[PDB]
Scaffold this active site. Structure first.
Site, PDB file in Angstrom:
ATOM      1  CG  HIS A  68      -2.038  -1.141   1.031  1.00  0.00           C
ATOM      2  ND1 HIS A  68      -2.009  -2.285   1.767  1.00  0.00           N
ATOM      3  CD2 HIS A  68      -3.171  -1.223   0.290  1.00  0.00           C
ATOM      4  CE1 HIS A  68      -3.081  -3.021   1.497  1.00  0.00           C
ATOM      5  NE2 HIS A  68      -3.779  -2.384   0.564  1.00  0.00           N
ATOM      6  CG  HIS A  72      -1.690   0.249  -4.321  1.00  0.00           C
ATOM      7  ND1 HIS A  72      -2.318  -0.661  -5.103  1.00  0.00           N
ATOM      8  CD2 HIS A  72      -2.628   0.735  -3.497  1.00  0.00           C
ATOM      9  CE1 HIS A  72      -3.569  -0.827  -4.740  1.00  0.00           C
ATOM     10  NE2 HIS A  72      -3.817   0.067  -3.739  1.00  0.00           N
ATOM     11  CG  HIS A 106      -6.996   4.401  -3.397  1.00  0.00           C
ATOM     12  ND1 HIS A 106      -5.961   4.377  -4.313  1.00  0.00           N
ATOM     13  CD2 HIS A 106      -7.101   3.146  -2.942  1.00  0.00           C
ATOM     14  CE1 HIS A 106      -5.418   3.190  -4.317  1.00  0.00           C
ATOM     15  NE2 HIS A 106      -6.058   2.429  -3.455  1.00  0.00           N
ATOM     16  CG  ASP A 107      -4.808   2.395  -0.419  1.00  0.00           C
ATOM     17  OD1 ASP A 107      -5.702   2.212   0.380  1.00  0.00           O
ATOM     18  OD2 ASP A 107      -4.533   1.553  -1.246  1.00  0.00           O
ATOM     19  CG  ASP A 217      -7.924  -0.772  -4.201  1.00  0.00           C
ATOM     20  OD1 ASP A 217      -6.703  -0.563  -4.250  1.00  0.00           O
ATOM     21  OD2 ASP A 217      -8.477  -1.036  -3.231  1.00  0.00           O
ATOM     22  CD  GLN A 269      -3.884 -14.749  -4.336  1.00  0.00           C
ATOM     23  OE1 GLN A 269      -3.922 -14.085  -5.362  1.00  0.00           O
ATOM     24  NE2 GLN A 269      -4.172 -14.245  -3.153  1.00  0.00           N
TER      25      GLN A 269
HETATM   26  C1  LIG Z   1      -7.894  -6.552  -0.991  1.00  0.00           C
HETATM   27  C2  LIG Z   1      -6.927  -7.382  -1.773  1.00  0.00           C
HETATM   28  C3  LIG Z   1      -6.187  -6.845  -2.813  1.00  0.00           C
HETATM   29  C4  LIG Z   1      -5.314  -7.643  -3.516  1.00  0.00           C
HETATM   30  C5  LIG Z   1      -5.184  -8.982  -3.170  1.00  0.00           C
HETATM   31  N1  LIG Z   1      -4.294  -9.844  -3.801  1.00  0.00           N
HETATM   32  C6  LIG Z   1      -3.388  -9.657  -4.864  1.00  0.00           C
HETATM   33  C7  LIG Z   1      -3.068 -10.761  -5.634  1.00  0.00           C
HETATM   34  N2  LIG Z   1      -2.207 -10.720  -6.648  1.00  0.00           N
HETATM   35  C8  LIG Z   1      -1.667  -9.537  -6.895  1.00  0.00           C
HETATM   36  N3  LIG Z   1      -1.881  -8.407  -6.235  1.00  0.00           N
HETATM   37  C9  LIG Z   1      -2.740  -8.484  -5.223  1.00  0.00           C
HETATM   38  C10 LIG Z   1      -5.951  -9.461  -2.071  1.00  0.00           C
HETATM   39  C11 LIG Z   1      -5.912 -10.878  -1.593  1.00  0.00           C
HETATM   40  O1  LIG Z   1      -4.978 -11.624  -1.841  1.00  0.00           O
HETATM   41  N4  LIG Z   1      -7.015 -11.251  -0.873  1.00  0.00           N
HETATM   42  C12 LIG Z   1      -7.308 -12.449  -0.274  1.00  0.00           C
HETATM   43  C13 LIG Z   1      -6.653 -13.647  -0.242  1.00  0.00           C
HETATM   44  C14 LIG Z   1      -7.478 -14.490   0.514  1.00  0.00           C
HETATM   45  C15 LIG Z   1      -7.239 -15.916   0.889  1.00  0.00           C
HETATM   46  N5  LIG Z   1      -8.587 -13.876   0.901  1.00  0.00           N
HETATM   47  N6  LIG Z   1      -8.478 -12.612   0.399  1.00  0.00           N
HETATM   48  C16 LIG Z   1      -9.514 -11.674   0.697  1.00  0.00           C
HETATM   49  C17 LIG Z   1      -9.193 -10.395   1.134  1.00  0.00           C
HETATM   50  C18 LIG Z   1     -10.202  -9.498   1.425  1.00  0.00           C
HETATM   51  C19 LIG Z   1     -11.523  -9.865   1.286  1.00  0.00           C
HETATM   52  C20 LIG Z   1     -11.841 -11.137   0.860  1.00  0.00           C
HETATM   53  C21 LIG Z   1     -10.840 -12.047   0.565  1.00  0.00           C
HETATM   54  N7  LIG Z   1      -6.810  -8.669  -1.413  1.00  0.00           N
HETATM   55 MG   LIG Z   2      -7.301   1.208   0.743  1.00  0.00          MG
HETATM   56 ZN   LIG Z   3      -5.591   0.525  -2.660  1.00  0.00          ZN
END
Ligand SMILES: Cc1ccc(Nc2cncnc2)c(C(=O)Nc2cc(C)nn2-c2ccccc2)n1
Ligand SMILES: [Mg+2]
Ligand SMILES: [Zn+2]
Length: 313
Positions: A68, A72, A106-107, A217, A269
């Site tokens: 962040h 980003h 935004h961050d 985002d 993922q």
């Molecule tokens: C917000 C956000 C932004 C980017 C994200 N990944 C990313 C991957 N590749 C490259 N750049 C970034 C991830 C991410 O990995 N999230 C996530 C993994 C799991 C097991 N659960 N979640 C999850 C998180 C919030 C709400 C619901 C599920 N989250």
């Molecule tokens: Mg944010």
């Molecule tokens: Zn962001």
């Protein structure tokens, strides 16, 4: 006014594609932004002196965190630029103005910790803003920077256009709270399927600009696979640091944040892409068909994580 920003040939051409990576030269990123503003917005819309001074104060207020961070901020602004250029006639002057600014800010001042962690820690920011904690903080940081001397890049808007732009920005930034995304996409899906979606209904545009801010985002998942896979290491660096900190409050953290459960990242993922990312880009492509490249790249990455799990990589 004829001081037009230029880019080398590869970047000039690739900046127009959704999957553009801004590169590892940090000192080119302010110009990639000014370039995107001039082409998206016009070169008379910001006083170059004020815009550059604002950009530098914004960059100064992004911390050194693995995900962040300033990179980003610029990367989310490039996705927004690509949505606006692919949907030229659908947005107003003030909307193009505010939104690219909303993406860069935004961050602002992100410490690398989620809303959940701030409330478990009982951080004073959780006392001030009981929901979308970090996002109300991000908007607050934006208004403070806009009110520094020589930073008011909207100075020549009328009182009413100025109030309109701050309001486009506050709503754009609040939307990046993923807790609000689930609700918002469902409502857009219900409006889309019943054909009541009306881009003249201001409450409806607000929902659409919301979904655009989610899309921008999360756009690290729409990149070519080497960029997405490497950005995933930065996001997990932050998640695991938060998990570390959860354990110091004496809370066992969710598998996503536990660095002892690195084995399950591939399967985790899959759920992220199936529960959040794929639906996001699907509904966005239903509302704005020319953003289809983002869904196609998001699905290629799901396939790539499926291939990791089957040990073909
Ligand atoms: C917000 C956000 C932004 C980017 C994200 N990944 C990313 C991957 N590749 C490259 N750049 C970034 C991830 C991410 O990995 N999230 C996530 C993994 C799991 C097991 N659960 N979640 C999850 C998180 C919030 C709400 C619901 C599920 N989250
Ligand atoms: Mg944010
Ligand atoms: Zn962001």
């Amino acid at each position: 006014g004829l001081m037009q920003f230029t880019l080398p040939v590869r970047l000039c051409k690739e900046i127009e594609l959704f999957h553009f990576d801004i590169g590892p030269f940090e000192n080119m990123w302010p110009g990639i932004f000014v370039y995107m503003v001039h082409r998206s917005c016009g070169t008379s819309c910001f006083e170059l002196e004020k815009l550059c001074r604002f950009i530098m104060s914004v960059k100064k207020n992004y911390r050194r965190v693995p995900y962040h961070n300033w990179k980003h901020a610029v990367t989310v602004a490039h996705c927004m630029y690509a949505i606006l250029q692919n949907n030229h006639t659908l947005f107003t002057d003030l909307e193009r103005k505010g939104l690219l600014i909303a993406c860069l800010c935004h961050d602002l001042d992100h410490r690398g910790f989620s809303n959940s962690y701030l409330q478990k820690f009982d951080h004073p920011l959780a006392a001030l803003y009981s929901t979308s904690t970090m996002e109300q903080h991000h908007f607050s940081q934006t208004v403070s920077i806009l009110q520094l001397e020589g930073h008011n890049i909207f100075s020549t808007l009328s009182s009413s256009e100025y109030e309109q732009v701050l309001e486009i920005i506050r709503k754009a930034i609040i939307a990046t709270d993923l807790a609000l995304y689930f609700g918002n996409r469902k409502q857009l899906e219900e409006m889309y399927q019943t054909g009541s979606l009306n881009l003249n209904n201001q409450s409806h545009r607000d929902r659409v600009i919301g979904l655009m801010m989610t899309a921008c985002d999360l756009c690290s998942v729409t990149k070519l696979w080497p960029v997405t896979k490497l950005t995933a290491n930065d996001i997990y660096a932050e998640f695991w640091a938060e998990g570390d900190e959860m354990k110091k409050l004496g809370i066992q953290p969710i598998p996503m944040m536990d660095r002892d459960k690195k084995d399950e990242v591939p399967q985790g993922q899959l759920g992220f892409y199936n529960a959040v990312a794929i639906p996001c880009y699907t509904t966005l492509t239903q509302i704005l068909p020319p953003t289809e490249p983002l869904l196609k790249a998001c699905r290629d990455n799901l396939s790539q994580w499926e291939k990791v799990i089957r040990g073909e990589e």
